[PDB]
């Protein structure tokens, strides 16, 4: 099961980005869709399922791509995007 079941709802994850510092650069809508919530500290986000944390987001970064790059064993990522998608990033 998920590491943090309480953030399993995409709407709750989206609400967490109310003070996100990079709205133009990396859309909260995409981050929330990809399983991430904002920790509230700088640009640090975390996946509700694997609990993997990412920071130092750059212009044009794609949340799903970064999810697969750094946490390829996440079961939320696998269920959502499939194995072909993960393998292609690696």
């Amino acid at each position: 099961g998920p590491a943090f079941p309480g953030m399993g709802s995409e709407e709750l994850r989206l609400a967490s980005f109310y003070d996100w510092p990079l709205t133009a650069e990396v859309p909260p809508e995409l981050l929330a869709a990809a399983g991430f919530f904002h920790t509230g500290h700088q640009d640090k986000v975390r996946c509700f399922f694997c609990y993997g944390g990412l920071q130092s987001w750059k212009r044009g970064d794609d949340p799903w791509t970064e999810h697969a790059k750094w946490f390829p064993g996440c079961q939320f990522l696998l269920r959502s995007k499939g194995q072909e998608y993960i393998n292609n990033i690696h």
Binding site: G53, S56, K58, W70
Partner: peptide, 4 residues
């Protein structure tokens, strides 16, 4: 991005 990079891991925390």
């Amino acid at each position: 991005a990079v891991p925390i």
